[PDB]
Scaffold this active site. Structure first.
Site, PDB file in Angstrom:
ATOM      1  N   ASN A  26       0.940  -1.001   0.079  1.00 12.88           N
ATOM      2  CA  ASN A  26       0.106   0.124  -0.043  1.00 12.88           C
ATOM      3  C   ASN A  26       1.015   1.286  -0.282  1.00 12.88           C
ATOM      4  OD1 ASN A  26      -1.484   2.317   0.799  1.00 12.88           O
ATOM      5  ND2 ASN A  26      -3.043   1.025   1.616  1.00 12.88           N
ATOM      6  N   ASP A  28       0.417   4.445  -0.592  1.00  2.49           N
ATOM      7  CA  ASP A  28       0.084   5.871  -0.201  1.00  2.49           C
ATOM      8  C   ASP A  28       0.497   6.646  -1.357  1.00  2.49           C
ATOM      9  OD1 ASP A  28      -1.233   7.585   1.269  1.00  2.49           O
ATOM     10  OD2 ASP A  28       0.467   8.252   2.275  1.00  2.49           O
ATOM     11  N   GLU A  54      -3.796   1.485  -2.686  1.00 11.24           N
ATOM     12  CA  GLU A  54      -3.971   2.896  -2.610  1.00 11.24           C
ATOM     13  C   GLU A  54      -3.070   3.607  -3.797  1.00 11.24           C
ATOM     14  OE1 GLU A  54      -3.496   4.061   1.774  1.00 11.24           O
ATOM     15  OE2 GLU A  54      -5.500   4.984   1.558  1.00 11.24           O
ATOM     16  N   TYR A 129      -8.040  -3.499  -1.493  1.00  8.72           N
ATOM     17  CA  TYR A 129      -7.682  -2.576  -0.621  1.00  8.72           C
ATOM     18  C   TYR A 129      -9.017  -2.230  -0.111  1.00  8.72           C
ATOM     19  CZ  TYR A 129      -7.394   1.917   1.295  1.00  8.72           C
ATOM     20  OH  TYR A 129      -7.658   3.190   2.161  1.00  8.72           O
ATOM     21  N   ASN A 170      -7.487  -4.171   5.608  1.00 12.46           N
ATOM     22  CA  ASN A 170      -8.031  -3.036   6.336  1.00 12.46           C
ATOM     23  C   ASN A 170      -8.624  -3.445   8.019  1.00 12.46           C
ATOM     24  OD1 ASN A 170      -7.115  -0.290   6.578  1.00 12.46           O
ATOM     25  ND2 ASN A 170      -8.748   0.224   4.943  1.00 12.46           N
ATOM     26  N   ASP A 266       3.119   4.899   4.479  1.00 13.08           N
ATOM     27  CA  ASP A 266       2.657   4.565   5.927  1.00 13.08           C
ATOM     28  C   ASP A 266       2.505   3.463   6.143  1.00 13.08           C
ATOM     29  OD1 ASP A 266      -0.942   5.640   5.384  1.00 13.08           O
ATOM     30  OD2 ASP A 266       0.508   4.856   3.827  1.00 13.08           O
TER      31      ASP A 266
END
Length: 276
Positions: A26, A28, A54, A129, A170, A266
């Site tokens: 991921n 970001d 993402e 995601y 998530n 992140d």
DNA sequence: GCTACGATCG
DNA sequence: CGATCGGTAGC
């Protein structure tokens, strides 16, 4: 306050060597991460498959260095219908995929470009995601609807060939899956609905938490740390990215790493070796 | 400056 | 607890 990822164990319990490396990340913001020297790491990692979460970016804008990526000649992308610069996923691979579908076969959940299924020879790969329940949990009620569906869809896939699900799923499944379990029971990623739904997910298919299966004891293994505070320099994070794979893939399961020192966003990347 | 990706310390 | 100051990438 530590957690040092162990050495790369490149062999199955059976005995044979690795024959497939899958990295997921991921990033970001694809673009940003790229400038952040992400592909150097990628080229440096040499995964046979690279799933990115993402990406938050549409194809008529994808950085040129992408195609210039050697052993990842087959690139597939997905972005939100009405959400510009949001969500977006991207699956890249060395060997070309037999079949490549986008989404989970459901209108309202597919409209955000969060899923990519790549059918292969010995198994099938999906990169996702998962819909954040948002701050104040404005979307937790909806989230569960996704989950209800998501496990439903994944099951029908684990009926033909060995499934490999990866991405920012998530959810901090267990309390062991985040630095502060108690102080976040009422914040997204750790709600008893999310956690339950996730567990429900595992059982239904069924699937297995590759990493957890390799380090049931090992704590402080986080794949995400918020940008707020100096979170990462203090390892105060969550483990939101997984490698859930069918039961049949466990005797072939080599390792599941959490490349923590990999700077880029992140989240940190996660690689899965398979002695297929 | 805002909007969607939560550790602090009252 | 639970209010909030608060790091990002992208519009």
């Amino acid at each position: 306050a530590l957690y040092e990822d162990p050495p790369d164990h490149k062999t199955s319990p059976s005995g044979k060597p690795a024959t497939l490396k899958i990295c997921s990340w991921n990033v970001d913001g694809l673009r940003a991460w790229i400038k952040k020297k992400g592909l150097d790491w990628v080229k440096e990692e040499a995964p046979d498959i690279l799933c990115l979460q993402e990406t938050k970016c549409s194809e008529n804008k994808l950085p040129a260095e992408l195609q210039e990526l050697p052993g990842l000649s087959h690139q597939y992308w997905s972005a939100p219908s009405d959400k510009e610069g949001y969500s977006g996923v991207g699956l890249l691979s060395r060997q070309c995929p037999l079949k490549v579908s986008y989404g989970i076969g459901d209108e309202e959940h597919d409209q955000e470009g969060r899923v990519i299924v790549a059918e292969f020879d010995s198994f099938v790969l999906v990169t996702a995601y998962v819909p954040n329940a948002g701050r104040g949990l404005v979307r937790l009620e909806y989230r569960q609807r996704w989950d209800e569906a998501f496990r439903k869809f994944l099951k029908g896939l684990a009926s033909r060939k060995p499934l490999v699900l990866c991405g920012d799923l998530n959810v901090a499944h267990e309390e062991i899956d985040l630095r502060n379990p108690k102080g976040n029971k009422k914040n997204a990623g750790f709600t008893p609905q999310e956690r339950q739904g996730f567990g429900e997910l595992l059982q239904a298919v069924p699937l297995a938490d590759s990493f957890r299966h390799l380090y049931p004891n090992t704590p402080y293994a986080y794949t995400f740390w918020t940008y707020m505070m100096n979170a990462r320099s203090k390892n105060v994070g969550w483990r939101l990215d997984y490698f859930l794979l069918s039961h049949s893939l466990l005797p072939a399961l080599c390792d599941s790493k959490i490349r923590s020192k990999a700077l880029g966003s992140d989240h940190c990347p996660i690689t899965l070796y398979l002695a297929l």
